Symmetry: C2
Subunit: 338 residues, 2 copies
């Protein structure tokens, strides 16, 4: 699925090896790895299909980053450091905890200074694989001059050529990520174009097209975990999510100089290879190209997902209580569209 490991330059041996990939209950096809000059790449990006561009130098200067360097050249600054009790990082939207008062969060986020992060990070590495941390921070923290330089060294010309050539809109977000081995962010989906610039370490990426909605079972729109598959990929419950047995995604392993496009609405599942050491990556999120007023039929999968999403929110308003959403949809269907 992820293909045979790539060989490191200067006979340094296979980049990674199969034992470092976690086990899953489904097939996968490889995402094509190409050059930014290859016409087929611009194509795939235009038909909103994932690609792995290998020579964009988007993050060239950052390829030298590492803990030591980073702590040494970054200002005090606050760094959101997410922590989990296992490999699965269970992120959640606080603003929606009211709607599901019995939802107990399993991913604390603590603000701390970079060095403090490195500390706890090493601690775990000496006592043991207890928690797993994940520092996610934006690239606007006036950080060490050294860093700002590197941030400037990024290939903006290129990435911008995209933002315009593709017709997308504003760059919604830009985060820096440093994780440990085995870190996994369960499958989920954004409604924005994605570019993941791998830097240090290798990351396994698994994507499912929006049309795989019926097999992934997102949480209810009003649920803290909205946009995330409810299926434990480590132990699917085919009794509740039977169509998970029909899921099929594209996968690939990204290394230091690679940039993976993740078309909006797609489902991505990210995991830092086991025994692969720490991983550093910077991600970019561009708001999508404004939708055409002329809607052609039939609709693309994401257009439906849009529809579904809205109707749910719509009933949230109407009924004045997101809990009643379910019961309504059911009476509306049972015996009628069953």
């Amino acid at each position: 699925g992820s293909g045979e490991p790539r060989e490191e330059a200067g006979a340094l041996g296979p980049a990674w090896d199969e034992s470092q990939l976690r086990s899953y209950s489904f097939p996968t096809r490889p995402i094509p790895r190409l050059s930014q000059s290859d016409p087929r790449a611009e194509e795939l990006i235009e038909n909103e299909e994932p690609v792995v561009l290998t020579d964009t130098n988007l993050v060239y200067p950052a390829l030298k980053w590492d803990l030591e360097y980073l702590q040494e050249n970054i200002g005090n600054g606050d760094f959101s450091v997410y922590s989990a009790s296992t490999h699965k990082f269970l992120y959640y939207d606080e603003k929606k905890m009211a709607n599901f008062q019995n939802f107990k969060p399993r991913s604390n986020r603590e603000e701390m200074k970079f060095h403090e992060f490195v500390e706890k990070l090493q601690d775990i590495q000496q006592r043991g694989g207890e928690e797993r941390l994940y520092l996610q921070q934006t690239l606007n923290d006036t950080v060490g001059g050294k860093i700002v330089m590197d941030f400037l060294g990024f290939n903006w010309n290129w990435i911008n050529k995209q933002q315009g050539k593709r017709g997308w809109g504003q760059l919604t977000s830009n985060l820096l990520l440093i994780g440990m081995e085995g870190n996994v962010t369960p499958a989920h989906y954004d409604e924005q174009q994605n570019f993941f610039a791998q830097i240090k370490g290798y990351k396994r990426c698994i994507l499912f097209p929006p049309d795989q909605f019926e097999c992934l079972y997102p949480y209810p729109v009003h649920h803290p975990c909205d946009r995330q598959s409810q299926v434990d990929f480590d132990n699917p419950d085919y009794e509740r999510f039977p169509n998970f047995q029909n899921v099929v995604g594209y996968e690939t392993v990204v290394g230091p100089g690679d940039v993976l496009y993740i078309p909006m609405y797609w489902w991505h599942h990210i995991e830092s290879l086991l025994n692969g050491g720490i991983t550093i990556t910077v991600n970019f999120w561009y708001k999508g190209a404004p939708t055409p007023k002329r809607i052609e039929y039939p609709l693309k999968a994401h257009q439906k997902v849009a529809i579904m999403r809205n109707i749910e929110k719509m009933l949230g308003e109407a009924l004045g209580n997101p809990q009643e959403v379910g019961p309504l949809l059911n009476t509306m269907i049972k015996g009628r569209y069953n």
Copy 2:
């Protein structure tokens, strides 16, 4: 359920008798029979609960109408005469036959002159209970002067006191109905206030509150039979409509001088008593009182029905094909709000 027959004045014997009522698989409570001067009646009408007003004289002059009289005093005029092959009259909205191309209609409507109606009507009565006819025509056909007089004799003062005192809007429709024994119009619902002025013969009326939606299973909004229960009351299919076993309605038998209020959205099922001869009745349909901009929660059942109705139509637009409605609702629910 419908109570013991009322005794006819002047020792003419019980009005009707139990053997004339069809058999059904569910319990029923009686609708209260009151006087228009009774405060409780205005109450029930205000809380949109059905009542049977017995002394409104709404249709006093018409109580003399009968075939002979009617044919004799009504202009040529065209009279929609619906015909069925059995007791169940299967009405349908033509404008929605495109959406269900495999829908085969079982209720022809033929335009004809009153006398022609009486003819065919008697024919059936001599050869036999083959078809069952049902003449439904508006009260604006410039008909025989004799009739116009009677139409004027109606108690407009009263009925208007309602249209205003209740806050309702325009009188949407006003039809005249003449049916034969055993005629049944399967349960269904209007979104308008109803007043049924019985004239000749006796009619059995069965109503279910809007909150009985989950037990009645209306057809899909885009279906020719939209607004009608899909359940054959003569042979329910508890396998597909299990909640029909929880249905419970109010019932009553209307005779010559009675007027039954049928609050908007409610479900009514009408049948002309077996061996009761022909039935004549004039019905009034008033558009409801404009909805308050201030919506109190939780919502009344009909408010939900409104919601559901809309969402269906909404998906009809969006997906550009009422057929896809079902499949969408299901993927949206399966594994999510199941």
